Amino acid sequence: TSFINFAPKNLKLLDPKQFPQGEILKALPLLKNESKEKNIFHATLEIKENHIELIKGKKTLFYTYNGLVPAPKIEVFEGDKLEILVKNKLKEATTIHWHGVPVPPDQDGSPHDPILAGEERIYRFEIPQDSAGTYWYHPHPHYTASKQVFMGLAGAFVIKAKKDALSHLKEKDLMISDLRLDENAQIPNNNLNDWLNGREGEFVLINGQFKPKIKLATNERIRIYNATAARYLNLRIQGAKFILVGTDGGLIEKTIYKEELFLSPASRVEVLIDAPKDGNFKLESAYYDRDKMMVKEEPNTLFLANINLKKENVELPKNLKIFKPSEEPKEFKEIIMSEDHMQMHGMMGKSEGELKIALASMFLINRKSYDLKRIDLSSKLGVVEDWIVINKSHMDHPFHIHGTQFELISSKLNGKVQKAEFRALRDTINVRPNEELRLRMKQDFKGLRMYHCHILEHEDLGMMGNLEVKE
Ligand SMILES: [Cu+2]
Ligand SMILES: [Cu+2]
Ligand SMILES: [Cu+2]
Ligand SMILES: [Cu+2]
Numbered sequence: 001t002s003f004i005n006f007a008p009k010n011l012k013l014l015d016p017k018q019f020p021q022g023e024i025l026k027a028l029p030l031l032k033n034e035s036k037e038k039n040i041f042h043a044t045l046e047i048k049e050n051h052i053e054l055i056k057g058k059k060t061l062f063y064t065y066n067g068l069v070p071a072p073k074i075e076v077f078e079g080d081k082l083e084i085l086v087k088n089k090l091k092e093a094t095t096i097h098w099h100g101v102p103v104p105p106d107q108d109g110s111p112h113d114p115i116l117a118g119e120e121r122i123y124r125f126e127i128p129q130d131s132a133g134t135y136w137y138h139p140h141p142h143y144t145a146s147k148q149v150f151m152g153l154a155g156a157f158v159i160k161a162k163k164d165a166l167s168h169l170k171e172k173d174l175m176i177s178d179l180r181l182d183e184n185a186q187i188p189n190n191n192l193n194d195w196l197n198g199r200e201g202e203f204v205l206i207n208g209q210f211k212p213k214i215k216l217a218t219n220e221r222i223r224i225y226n227a228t229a230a231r232y233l234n235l236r237i238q239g240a241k242f243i244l245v246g247t248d249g250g251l252i253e254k255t256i257y258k259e260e261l262f263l264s265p266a267s268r269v270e271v272l273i274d275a276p277k278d279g280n281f282k283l284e285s286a287y288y289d290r291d292k293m294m295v296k297e298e299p300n301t302l303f304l305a306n307i308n309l310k311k312e313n314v315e316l317p318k319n320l321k322i323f324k325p326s327e328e329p330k331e332f333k334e335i336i337m338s339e340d341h342m343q344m345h346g347m348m349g350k351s352e353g354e355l356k357i358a359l360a361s362m363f364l365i366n367r368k369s370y371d372l373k374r375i376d377l378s379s380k381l382g383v384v385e386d387w388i389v390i391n392k393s394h395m396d397h398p399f400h401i402h403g404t405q406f407e408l409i410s411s412k413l414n415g416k417v418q419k420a421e422f423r424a425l426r427d428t429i430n431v432r433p434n435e436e437l438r439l440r441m442k443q444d445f446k447g448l449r450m451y452h453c454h455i456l457e458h459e460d461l462g463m464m465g466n467l468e469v470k471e
Pocket of ligand 2: 100402
């Protein structure tokens, strides 16, 4: 439990007036392709500490990809062949997980295959047909994923089709992260509440920028990334609506119109914005009560950014994407997410050391904590399965499974059933307290996969298991 560090008690945080704000939103920098061959993407990611003059007077220590905040975006096409050299220049082990991207387990940066401090690894994989979607990359080492993210390590990863219903549209990225700064402009350690609830950095950023001015138009294909450790968003633009056109694993069948867009941690969508006319709007997130513990919160709306919106009509087809007929499942899995508050009650009498033990045995899957060495579940290569994911705890947890996209079939809550509102492919899904979800998927590569809560602090505290995929 040496990975559990608590911030100083009554740590004072930075005054938000000191944080640069109100700037025009910039596009993410792209990770340069070192190769000139057709359909070949070659590049290098260095993972390193850097000191950034963000707050006047002060240098802020970040962990970065290629020394950049925000990180370089990877953008490739279906059918491309990728090779990325990754150099770990941190003083601790790390990995890169291509979150949601269908790659073989040995190319996917799980805590089984760490990159030690001072070493390097090459990741190599093909971009499959039909994999167009909106993904991201971030660390997944044992125990320290939450700190490495909160230090700055998260980047965009997009797979494009050579041609699809929206591929002629100009694109925009709204990559949403969050950042905590102390009174001396440094990124502090988690406190107890962050470990219990998942850490939410007070400064919520879009492409690394605080309260920016965004120029958008209604004929743009906008990718939105919830790249936070634990923050639930319920996005809205009063006076406008979202036209949902895609989820993690790409386009959906038909436009879905939404006044609010719920985006739990690690989820991504593609949207257009609809409004009747040109205008100036505000991007906000409505408070979502996720039953955080030891916190009484103001149910406040979070303001994220100003949007200057240009109205341009755009032709949208009747069908965005033709989905394959749903396949029949042949085996079934059950995932129970739960918590043990045996200990933690009597918070009052515990030393720092005993809180750490409590935290480490608290967040469970199928009544167990993560064991790096234990195979929890086994599935057959290429076989369609339904996974029944149930949340028996008092608080939301977003479920993630590596290696595949799944389709929500149906959900149940409070003794009632709701069939999915539309077919979509996701790799991460919120599970409400007492809710039961039915998720259809298959695994197309042999080897080990994890599945876990994607509130990063819960994952690091053991809310995770191992899946073995065999022939
Ligand atoms: Cu992830
Ligand atoms: Cu993942
Ligand atoms: Cu993971
Ligand atoms: Cu959780």
